Amino acid sequence: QACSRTCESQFCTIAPLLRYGKYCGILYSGCPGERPCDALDACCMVHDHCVDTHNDDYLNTMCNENLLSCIDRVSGATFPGNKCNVGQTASVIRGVIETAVFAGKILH
Ligand SMILES: [Ca+2]
């Protein structure tokens, strides 16, 4: 219930408040079985489930580095009504994940 079935495009350039697609955003995720909204959204869906299936470790290196690889290869159409620039938003996301990767190496 506490999940998204709609493709959002909100606070595109503000990482703490960003909500993009059904999956991209902090503590913001699509409901079970929900199709991602575009290529960027699909990267975020995989990442979200990866963290979920690794004891909620948002600093997991696999999860995080896999998202970076995925982000760098994002292309194609986006969903209707998208207020965000896809490339600019992927960059915003990438910065957050870079920070998480660095945080993980500090702690581990
Ligand atoms: Ca999310």
mmCIF file of N, CA, C and O in Angstrom, residues 36-83:
data_model
loop_
_atom_site.group_PDB
_atom_site.id
_atom_site.type_symbol
_atom_site.label_atom_id
_atom_site.label_comp_id
_atom_site.label_asym_id
_atom_site.label_seq_id
_atom_site.Cartn_x
_atom_site.Cartn_y
_atom_site.Cartn_z
ATOM 1 N N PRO A 36 8.281 -0.473 -14.540
ATOM 2 C CA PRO A 36 8.991 0.802 -14.499
ATOM 3 C C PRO A 36 8.648 1.685 -15.701
ATOM 4 O O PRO A 36 8.229 1.184 -16.755
ATOM 5 N N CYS A 37 8.834 2.986 -15.526
ATOM 6 C CA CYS A 37 8.304 4.001 -16.442
ATOM 7 C C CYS A 37 9.186 4.317 -17.654
ATOM 8 O O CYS A 37 8.699 4.793 -18.678
ATOM 9 N N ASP A 38 10.486 4.098 -17.503
ATOM 10 C CA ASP A 38 11.458 4.239 -18.580
ATOM 11 C C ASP A 38 12.729 3.511 -18.166
ATOM 12 O O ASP A 38 12.733 2.837 -17.130
ATOM 13 N N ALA A 39 13.785 3.648 -18.973
ATOM 14 C CA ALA A 39 15.078 3.006 -18.716
ATOM 15 C C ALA A 39 15.693 3.438 -17.383
ATOM 16 O O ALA A 39 16.166 2.605 -16.628
ATOM 17 N N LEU A 40 15.681 4.736 -17.087
ATOM 18 C CA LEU A 40 16.179 5.221 -15.806
ATOM 19 C C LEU A 40 15.383 4.616 -14.650
ATOM 20 O O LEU A 40 15.964 4.180 -13.656
ATOM 21 N N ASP A 41 14.061 4.583 -14.785
ATOM 22 C CA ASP A 41 13.200 4.017 -13.751
ATOM 23 C C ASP A 41 13.487 2.549 -13.494
ATOM 24 O O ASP A 41 13.445 2.106 -12.344
ATOM 25 N N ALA A 42 13.785 1.808 -14.566
ATOM 26 C CA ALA A 42 14.117 0.389 -14.487
ATOM 27 C C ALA A 42 15.428 0.127 -13.738
ATOM 28 O O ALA A 42 15.545 -0.856 -13.013
ATOM 29 N N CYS A 43 16.408 1.006 -13.922
ATOM 30 C CA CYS A 43 17.646 0.959 -13.147
ATOM 31 C C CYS A 43 17.367 1.084 -11.656
ATOM 32 O O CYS A 43 17.961 0.365 -10.848
ATOM 33 N N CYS A 44 16.469 2.006 -11.309
ATOM 34 C CA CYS A 44 16.069 2.264 -9.922
ATOM 35 C C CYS A 44 15.272 1.124 -9.303
ATOM 36 O O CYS A 44 15.383 0.875 -8.113
ATOM 37 N N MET A 45 14.462 0.449 -10.105
ATOM 38 C CA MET A 45 13.711 -0.736 -9.672
ATOM 39 C C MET A 45 14.615 -1.897 -9.267
ATOM 40 O O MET A 45 14.404 -2.537 -8.234
ATOM 41 N N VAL A 46 15.606 -2.183 -10.109
ATOM 42 C CA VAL A 46 16.589 -3.200 -9.810
ATOM 43 C C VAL A 46 17.356 -2.837 -8.532
ATOM 44 O O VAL A 46 17.530 -3.680 -7.641
ATOM 45 N N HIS A 47 17.804 -1.585 -8.442
ATOM 46 C CA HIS A 47 18.543 -1.123 -7.271
ATOM 47 C C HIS A 47 17.713 -1.283 -6.004
ATOM 48 O O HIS A 47 18.221 -1.747 -4.998
ATOM 49 N N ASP A 48 16.431 -0.924 -6.074
ATOM 50 C CA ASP A 48 15.547 -0.957 -4.911
ATOM 51 C C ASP A 48 15.380 -2.366 -4.360
ATOM 52 O O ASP A 48 15.432 -2.576 -3.144
ATOM 53 N N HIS A 49 15.158 -3.313 -5.267
ATOM 54 C CA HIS A 49 15.029 -4.728 -4.917
ATOM 55 C C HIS A 49 16.348 -5.336 -4.437
ATOM 56 O O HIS A 49 16.343 -6.196 -3.572
ATOM 57 N N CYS A 50 17.459 -4.894 -5.025
ATOM 58 C CA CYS A 50 18.790 -5.308 -4.618
ATOM 59 C C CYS A 50 19.077 -4.973 -3.156
ATOM 60 O O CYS A 50 19.623 -5.792 -2.427
ATOM 61 N N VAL A 51 18.730 -3.754 -2.756
ATOM 62 C CA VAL A 51 18.881 -3.296 -1.381
ATOM 63 C C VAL A 51 17.970 -4.106 -0.466
ATOM 64 O O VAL A 51 18.424 -4.622 0.561
ATOM 65 N N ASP A 52 16.699 -4.226 -0.865
ATOM 66 C CA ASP A 52 15.727 -5.079 -0.183
ATOM 67 C C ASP A 52 16.204 -6.502 0.096
ATOM 68 O O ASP A 52 15.991 -7.037 1.188
ATOM 69 N N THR A 53 16.836 -7.120 -0.895
ATOM 70 C CA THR A 53 17.253 -8.518 -0.762
ATOM 71 C C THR A 53 18.673 -8.640 -0.201
ATOM 72 O O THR A 53 19.242 -9.728 -0.142
ATOM 73 N N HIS A 54 19.234 -7.511 0.224
ATOM 74 C CA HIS A 54 20.512 -7.510 0.922
ATOM 75 C C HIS A 54 20.378 -6.808 2.261
ATOM 76 O O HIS A 54 21.110 -5.864 2.556
ATOM 77 N N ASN A 55 19.425 -7.291 3.058
ATOM 78 C CA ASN A 55 19.210 -6.842 4.430
ATOM 79 C C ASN A 55 19.133 -5.313 4.573
ATOM 80 O O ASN A 55 19.662 -4.749 5.531
ATOM 81 N N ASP A 56 18.470 -4.663 3.611
ATOM 82 C CA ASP A 56 18.293 -3.196 3.556
ATOM 83 C C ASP A 56 19.592 -2.368 3.544
ATOM 84 O O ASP A 56 19.612 -1.206 3.994
ATOM 85 N N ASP A 57 20.661 -2.959 3.015
ATOM 86 C CA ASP A 57 21.960 -2.306 2.970
ATOM 87 C C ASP A 57 22.056 -1.451 1.722
ATOM 88 O O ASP A 57 22.408 -1.933 0.649
ATOM 89 N N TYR A 58 21.739 -0.170 1.882
ATOM 90 C CA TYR A 58 21.798 0.797 0.795
ATOM 91 C C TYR A 58 23.242 1.190 0.488
ATOM 92 O O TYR A 58 23.497 1.998 -0.412
ATOM 93 N N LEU A 59 24.179 0.621 1.245
ATOM 94 C CA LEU A 59 25.607 0.818 0.993
ATOM 95 C C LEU A 59 26.259 -0.418 0.360
ATOM 96 O O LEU A 59 27.490 -0.480 0.246
ATOM 97 N N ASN A 60 25.439 -1.392 -0.044
ATOM 98 C CA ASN A 60 25.934 -2.597 -0.717
ATOM 99 C C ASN A 60 26.591 -2.216 -2.045
ATOM 100 O O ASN A 60 25.980 -1.548 -2.878
ATOM 101 N N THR A 61 27.841 -2.642 -2.221
ATOM 102 C CA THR A 61 28.659 -2.262 -3.375
ATOM 103 C C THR A 61 28.119 -2.797 -4.695
ATOM 104 O O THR A 61 28.146 -2.084 -5.695
ATOM 105 N N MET A 62 27.632 -4.038 -4.699
ATOM 106 C CA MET A 62 27.014 -4.606 -5.898
ATOM 107 C C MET A 62 25.808 -3.780 -6.327
ATOM 108 O O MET A 62 25.759 -3.283 -7.458
ATOM 109 N N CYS A 63 24.849 -3.620 -5.413
ATOM 110 C CA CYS A 63 23.636 -2.847 -5.690
ATOM 111 C C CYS A 63 23.997 -1.502 -6.280
ATOM 112 O O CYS A 63 23.494 -1.131 -7.348
ATOM 113 N N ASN A 64 24.885 -0.798 -5.582
ATOM 114 C CA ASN A 64 25.264 0.560 -5.945
ATOM 115 C C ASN A 64 26.047 0.705 -7.234
ATOM 116 O O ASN A 64 25.730 1.568 -8.045
ATOM 117 N N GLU A 65 27.052 -0.150 -7.429
ATOM 118 C CA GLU A 65 27.851 -0.122 -8.654
ATOM 119 C C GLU A 65 27.046 -0.596 -9.871
ATOM 120 O O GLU A 65 27.238 -0.079 -10.972
ATOM 121 N N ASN A 66 26.122 -1.536 -9.664
ATOM 122 C CA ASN A 66 25.246 -1.999 -10.742
ATOM 123 C C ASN A 66 24.316 -0.894 -11.240
ATOM 124 O O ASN A 66 24.039 -0.809 -12.430
ATOM 125 N N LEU A 67 23.843 -0.057 -10.315
ATOM 126 C CA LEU A 67 23.041 1.113 -10.647
ATOM 127 C C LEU A 67 23.840 2.154 -11.446
ATOM 128 O O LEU A 67 23.341 2.687 -12.426
ATOM 129 N N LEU A 68 25.073 2.422 -11.037
ATOM 130 C CA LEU A 68 25.975 3.285 -11.797
ATOM 131 C C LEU A 68 26.169 2.799 -13.232
ATOM 132 O O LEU A 68 26.078 3.599 -14.157
ATOM 133 N N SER A 69 26.431 1.499 -13.415
ATOM 134 C CA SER A 69 26.575 0.904 -14.755
ATOM 135 C C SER A 69 25.289 1.079 -15.566
ATOM 136 O O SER A 69 25.327 1.363 -16.756
ATOM 137 N N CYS A 70 24.159 0.905 -14.895
ATOM 138 C CA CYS A 70 22.847 0.989 -15.516
ATOM 139 C C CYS A 70 22.517 2.424 -15.934
ATOM 140 O O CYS A 70 22.010 2.634 -17.038
ATOM 141 N N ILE A 71 22.788 3.386 -15.038
ATOM 142 C CA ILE A 71 22.547 4.822 -15.273
ATOM 143 C C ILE A 71 23.320 5.319 -16.496
ATOM 144 O O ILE A 71 22.772 6.049 -17.318
ATOM 145 N N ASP A 72 24.590 4.927 -16.596
ATOM 146 C CA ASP A 72 25.465 5.347 -17.701
ATOM 147 C C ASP A 72 25.046 4.814 -19.071
ATOM 148 O O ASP A 72 25.611 5.205 -20.100
ATOM 149 N N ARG A 73 24.051 3.930 -19.085
ATOM 150 C CA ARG A 73 23.616 3.307 -20.334
ATOM 151 C C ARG A 73 22.157 3.606 -20.649
ATOM 152 O O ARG A 73 21.589 3.025 -21.572
ATOM 153 N N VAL A 74 21.575 4.532 -19.888
ATOM 154 C CA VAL A 74 20.167 4.917 -20.032
ATOM 155 C C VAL A 74 19.915 5.636 -21.348
ATOM 156 O O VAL A 74 20.638 6.566 -21.703
ATOM 157 N N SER A 75 18.907 5.182 -22.085
ATOM 158 C CA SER A 75 18.509 5.845 -23.318
ATOM 159 C C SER A 75 17.101 5.447 -23.723
ATOM 160 O O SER A 75 16.494 4.564 -23.108
ATOM 161 N N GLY A 76 16.591 6.102 -24.763
ATOM 162 C CA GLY A 76 15.265 5.815 -25.294
ATOM 163 C C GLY A 76 14.234 6.832 -24.850
ATOM 164 O O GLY A 76 14.568 7.856 -24.236
ATOM 165 N N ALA A 77 12.974 6.540 -25.157
ATOM 166 C CA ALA A 77 11.873 7.425 -24.816
ATOM 167 C C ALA A 77 11.662 7.473 -23.311
ATOM 168 O O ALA A 77 12.160 6.615 -22.573
ATOM 169 N N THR A 78 10.947 8.489 -22.852
ATOM 170 C CA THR A 78 10.541 8.553 -21.450
ATOM 171 C C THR A 78 9.014 8.524 -21.343
ATOM 172 O O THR A 78 8.312 8.447 -22.350
ATOM 173 N N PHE A 79 8.498 8.564 -20.123
ATOM 174 C CA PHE A 79 7.060 8.460 -19.912
ATOM 175 C C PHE A 79 6.383 9.817 -20.157
ATOM 176 O O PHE A 79 7.030 10.856 -20.023
ATOM 177 N N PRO A 80 5.089 9.807 -20.550
ATOM 178 C CA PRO A 80 4.356 11.052 -20.769
ATOM 179 C C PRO A 80 4.209 11.881 -19.506
ATOM 180 O O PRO A 80 3.989 11.329 -18.430
ATOM 181 N N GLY A 81 4.337 13.200 -19.647
ATOM 182 C CA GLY A 81 4.142 14.134 -18.547
ATOM 183 C C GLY A 81 5.359 14.297 -17.657
ATOM 184 O O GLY A 81 5.259 14.866 -16.575
ATOM 185 N N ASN A 82 6.502 13.795 -18.116
ATOM 186 C CA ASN A 82 7.763 13.900 -17.388
ATOM 187 C C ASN A 82 8.236 15.343 -17.372
ATOM 188 O O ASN A 82 8.501 15.927 -18.420
ATOM 189 N N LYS A 83 8.318 15.931 -16.181
ATOM 190 C CA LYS A 83 8.779 17.306 -16.054
ATOM 191 C C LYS A 83 10.305 17.368 -16.015
ATOM 192 O O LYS A 83 10.891 18.421 -16.256
#
